[PDB]
Amino acid sequence: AVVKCKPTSPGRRHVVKVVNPELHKGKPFAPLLEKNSKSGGRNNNGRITTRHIGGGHKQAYRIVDFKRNKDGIPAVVERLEYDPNRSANIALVLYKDGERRYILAPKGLKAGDQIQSGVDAAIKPGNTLPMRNIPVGSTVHNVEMKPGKGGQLARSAGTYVQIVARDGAYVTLRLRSGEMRKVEADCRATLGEVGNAEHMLRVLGKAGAARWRGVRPTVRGTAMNPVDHPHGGGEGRNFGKHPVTPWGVQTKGKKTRSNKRTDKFIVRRRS
RNA sequence: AGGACCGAACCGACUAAUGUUGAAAAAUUAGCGGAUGACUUGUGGCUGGGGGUGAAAGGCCAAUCAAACCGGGAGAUAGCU
């Protein structure tokens, strides 16, 4: 649930929280956890590859099951759980065989609901089947791009795709980006939308709330000296040139997609 | 509950005086600011010079930075002293 806190102090007027009581107020299933040390935006060479990364709260990685290869074995939901490594919530399930696993939380799932994977599974949210058997015009999430590796699309808080057509060994999809992409007609996909849509309405309210996420301040460039950035400086606010990243790239329309390898599944890229 | 209030430790360094071959190659005295947090700190580790890092001042990188230090090319060149 979304709630607007009161302005009892500068730093809480425009803050907004997303409170969900369905989440388990305790410790998670340890057997599915592992170490995850932050990187600060650096690489094996110790150099900063991506800026604005550093600090924040500690984190543990919940091993999620994105493949869903446990076919023909139903499972019930034990409880929901908060996952920091991602924007979406997850679900702790229980298979009849005694095994437990993690998955992404669909829109309206709860505890006690039964789910099943495979080709003969039921057409209901949570269940997983290959798109070869999914009806056209439906909504799914956690889509696979190559059979067997695991889902890669529609993994975020409130993201969902829509199957629009299936001709042959391939299926076409309109992604949440408006792009019209096609994939092999054997990839698995989970019905329903990922349920945390109240996440976008969240608000940090103050800078410190960003530093908890591991985000660092972003220096513009205009106020940064000529040696540092193309925008450089000048007495006052001049910026009398074209917008450009460091290293000399426009950043205001210049398409940098230079794949040219697949370039077949793209139909209606966007806009 | 709080990047909340007063205020010691602690971290800072706004004003003034002193000192300026100083007690000190940036400190002291009397006050001041923050003081559960983007806080602070000990240990260890990574990032190496046209590069690093930088809540960005051309700032910091061993009292040295508009391109560190050491050695080498090197007895650079100097129509200038």
Place this chain on the structure above:
RNA sequence: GCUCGCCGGAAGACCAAGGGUUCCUGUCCAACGUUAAUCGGGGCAGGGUGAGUCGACCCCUAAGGCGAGGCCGAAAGGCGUAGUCGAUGGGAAACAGGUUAAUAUUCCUGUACUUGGUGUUACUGCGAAGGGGGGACGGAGAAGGCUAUGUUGGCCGGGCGACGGUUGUCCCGGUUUAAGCGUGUAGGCUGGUUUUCCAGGCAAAUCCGGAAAAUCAAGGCUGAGGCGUGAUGACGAGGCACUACGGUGCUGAAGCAACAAAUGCCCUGCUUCCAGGAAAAGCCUCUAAGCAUCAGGUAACAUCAAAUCGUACCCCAAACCGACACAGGUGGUCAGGUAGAGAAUACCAAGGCGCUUGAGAGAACUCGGGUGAAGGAACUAGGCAAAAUGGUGCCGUAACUUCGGGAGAAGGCACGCUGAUAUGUAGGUGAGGUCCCUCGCGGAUGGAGCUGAAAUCAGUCGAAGAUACCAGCUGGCUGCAACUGUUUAUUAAAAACACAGCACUGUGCAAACACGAAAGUGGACGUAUACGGUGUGACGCCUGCCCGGUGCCGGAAGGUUAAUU
């Protein structure tokens, strides 16, 4: 040696880091010490550092490093797997007292414990580079139960006061005692037990997990402290004998209780919030291959072993880092008394110092301070500096406002001491006894004793009762930025930089982008409610006109146009 004065949340005590004999004794005074020097962190000689339990080594691992093969690269060499290293983390065990000129939980006395080895006996399914559990973990907050510790009383010993009084409600001192073993409480978590089945735990599995039944609810785990033992001992104020007044033997009384009470323990708990909170081994289990009249394993007793290195001394400093015996900087532990909200502050205890030139004089001027006639910012670039305000409780408190604030607004009154209310109250604590009882560290009752506010009434002293130290100046108009913050170490802390928020834009995952001749890595073990970049900069009302120029995004008939032929 007698006085004085300073610190006393340190200028005291114990360590790490670091230094590396500066420690102790004797001796020397040329040099070193900012003076002298019989002294010294100085010179010379000698002596001194004793560990199964502290620490390191060792076992395990994080960040991260090296990196067999291997991938990559003109060479050098780079990244990295298996693995191996790497604490600032995890992992077995000792306390008290006494003692040396100098060491000690290391020596001695006394009392204990831990891990292994071997052997005897008895009972026995043992076995892993594997599986599972466990180890294993955040912030804030809230109390409650305890202790360290302290105060008072009582007891014991001693004392009767240089000057009035002091045999009493008088004065001083002491009233200490551990780990360990046993009890297993306050209180906290958990429902157990037996049988049966199974697509799982890379194979197995009595274990874990899951499912279905029956049967019982009391079962277990954790757990400060207290109590008892440890302890007929040790210590102990003080005496008796030696006593070179340098010390040694022996003796050695009381050694209880109440109250207060921690930031420390129960607490790695409980409640709660979002930013969602290390790993591995030891340890407890599981079984596989394998070994079974063996071997191994469990318990008891015996006996052996527990090596090696460090241990002195300083450690907020004269010994470390600062060229110096330098107003500097330096992490952790202990945390007394009165007042006090308080680790502030003031005066003190234990303890440790009086900061390595002194004497004298008492001009100008300088520094650091105190007071001030009348006036009260007229000074001055500027109320810079200084002065002043300063605490608690009650009343009371505007504009404006995002309805939280503004606000401690402003402003006003009372504060001491003694006595009574009440021979010390409300409250808190809680003895003895009585009653019960699963008869225990119990429960109910019980209210002695101890402690102890606050307020009221009257009275009283003083110029002044928040008397000292400590301890907000307030108010009004306005520009900038929203705010908390960050910044030019060493002349600039701001209207700059960040910021949440908004928008445009790119990016469909072997993502864009970046570091990299490359491999590969980060981005991200993320997936368009995500990520990167750019600009703007809370919030509120709004963000208008122009695409000729530059650039970007598309489009296509024609024209021009490279290599090549």
Place this chain on the structure above:
RNA sequence: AAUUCCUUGUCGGGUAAGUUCCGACCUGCACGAAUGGCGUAAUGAUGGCCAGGCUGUCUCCACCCGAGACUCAGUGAAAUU
């Protein structure tokens, strides 16, 4: 106006007297709407201005307490030339 050269613009407020401050007028030398415009409570060691109280800031300094200065003894520099 953090933007205004002419300029101490003009009027008025406040002052005995105000090149600054505040509020209006517009002839905007040379504001202008995300290199954002206009307002904005709160906040600020922020800039500017006016009052209350306060005072040695000053009129105009005076006296005193301490460390140096000065004299004696001991040790014993420096820039400069």
Place this chain on the structure above:
RNA sequence: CUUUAAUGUUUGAUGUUCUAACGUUGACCCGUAAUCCGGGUUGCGGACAGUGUCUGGUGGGUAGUUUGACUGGGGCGGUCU
């Protein structure tokens, strides 16, 4: 030898299809108690992609350099035979 159609064959262009090169930061198995790597099986792509040589354009992202003299100081202007 002037001529033009169905052929044989030639090479070029376009499209569709295929797999055997190549790729596979897809799955499974082995080396192997190893998310590297290699090999194998299979699938998806597929002669595209991507790399090398040559080449056009773009290219302050990064370097190397230039940016005159006289002058009643220099610059501006002016001048230079």
